[PDB]
Design an enzyme around this catalytic site. Structure first.
Site, PDB file in Angstrom:
ATOM      1  N   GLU A   1       0.793  -1.233   0.059  1.00 24.31           N
ATOM      2  CA  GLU A   1      -0.002  -0.008  -0.066  1.00 24.31           C
ATOM      3  C   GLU A   1       0.613   1.389   0.004  1.00 24.31           C
ATOM      4  O   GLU A   1       0.306   2.466  -0.526  1.00 24.31           O
ATOM      5  CB  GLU A   1      -0.721   0.129   1.347  1.00 24.31           C
ATOM      6  CG  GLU A   1      -1.940  -1.089   1.231  1.00 24.31           C
ATOM      7  CD  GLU A   1      -2.986  -0.984   0.143  1.00 24.31           C
ATOM      8  OE1 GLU A   1      -3.143   0.130  -0.169  1.00 24.31           O
ATOM      9  OE2 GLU A   1      -3.797  -1.918   0.293  1.00 24.31           O
TER      10      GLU A   1
ATOM     11  N   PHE B   1      -8.047  -6.757   3.406  1.00 21.61           N
ATOM     12  CA  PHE B   1      -7.899  -5.131   3.473  1.00 21.61           C
ATOM     13  C   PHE B   1      -8.266  -4.197   2.318  1.00 21.61           C
ATOM     14  O   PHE B   1      -8.568  -3.261   2.490  1.00 21.61           O
ATOM     15  CB  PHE B   1      -6.357  -5.022   3.723  1.00 21.61           C
ATOM     16  CG  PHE B   1      -5.869  -3.710   4.533  1.00 21.61           C
ATOM     17  CD1 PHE B   1      -5.705  -3.757   5.734  1.00 21.61           C
ATOM     18  CD2 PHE B   1      -5.510  -3.077   3.318  1.00 21.61           C
ATOM     19  CE1 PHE B   1      -5.305  -2.363   6.178  1.00 21.61           C
ATOM     20  CE2 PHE B   1      -4.833  -1.846   4.057  1.00 21.61           C
ATOM     21  CZ  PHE B   1      -4.712  -1.398   5.056  1.00 21.61           C
TER      22      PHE B   1
ATOM     23  N   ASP C   1      -6.661   6.816  -4.354  1.00 23.16           N
ATOM     24  CA  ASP C   1      -5.836   5.367  -4.507  1.00 23.16           C
ATOM     25  C   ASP C   1      -5.984   5.280  -6.082  1.00 23.16           C
ATOM     26  O   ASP C   1      -6.495   5.984  -6.956  1.00 23.16           O
ATOM     27  CB  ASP C   1      -6.689   4.606  -3.358  1.00 23.16           C
ATOM     28  CG  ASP C   1      -7.937   4.115  -4.137  1.00 23.16           C
ATOM     29  OD1 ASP C   1      -8.593   4.960  -4.708  1.00 23.16           O
ATOM     30  OD2 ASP C   1      -8.742   3.390  -3.399  1.00 23.16           O
TER      31      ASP C   1
END
Ligand SMILES: [Cl-]
Ligand SMILES: [Cl-]
EC number: 3.2.1.17
Length: 162
Positions: A11, A104, A20
């Site tokens: 990430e 996640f 993102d």
């Protein structure tokens, strides 16, 4: 290697609000703030999350704190899910890290719809599951990351993370 290091690699770390890969406002170590396209909405969410007027920027410790809570939440989401729990508990420790990572990144929701791959993973059909998993929007939109997770599920080792 562990879940934190693994996700920190997938990430990255950013202390200022960012967009993102899907264009949503996020911060820290992949912490989504909101899906809305209003930055203000995002700043408000940030403040709310941190407990202070951030003005779109946080500290490392603050980011790490969000990360902790986020990992925990994911695990807990897995455990509470009837379709997920049983798969998860059948896996070894490395592969469980691959499960957390997908959850996640995509939510308990997204993952819960990988029914076929889930069954293959539960049956320990590694190579079959890896092929199945690649047949997804997930692999086609973020292939480099998807590949690393998939190899992780396929092999049960940290080789993709070197
Ligand atoms: Cl929070
Ligand atoms: Cl990627």
């Amino acid at each position: 290697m562990n879940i934190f290091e693994m996700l920190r690699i997938d990430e990255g770390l950013r202390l200022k609000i960012y967009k993102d890969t899907e264009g949503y406002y996020t911060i820290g170590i992949g912490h989504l703030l909101t899906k809305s396209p209003s930055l203000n909405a995002a700043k408000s969410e940030l403040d709310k999350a941190i407990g202070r007027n951030c003005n779109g920027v946080i500290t490392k410790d603050e980011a790490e704190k969000l990360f902790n809570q986020d990992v925990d939440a994911a695990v807990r989401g897995i455990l509470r899910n009837a379709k997920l729990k049983p798969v998860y508990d059948s896996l070894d420790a490395v592969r469980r890290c691959a499960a957390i990572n997908q959850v996640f990144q995509m939510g308990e929701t997204g993952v819960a719809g990988f029914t076929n791959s889930l069954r293959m993973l539960q049956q320990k059909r590694w190579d079959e599951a890896a092929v199945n998993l690649a047949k997804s929007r997930w692999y086609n939109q973020t292939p480099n990351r998807a590949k690393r997770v998939i190899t992780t599920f396929r092999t049960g080792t940290w080789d993709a993370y070197k």
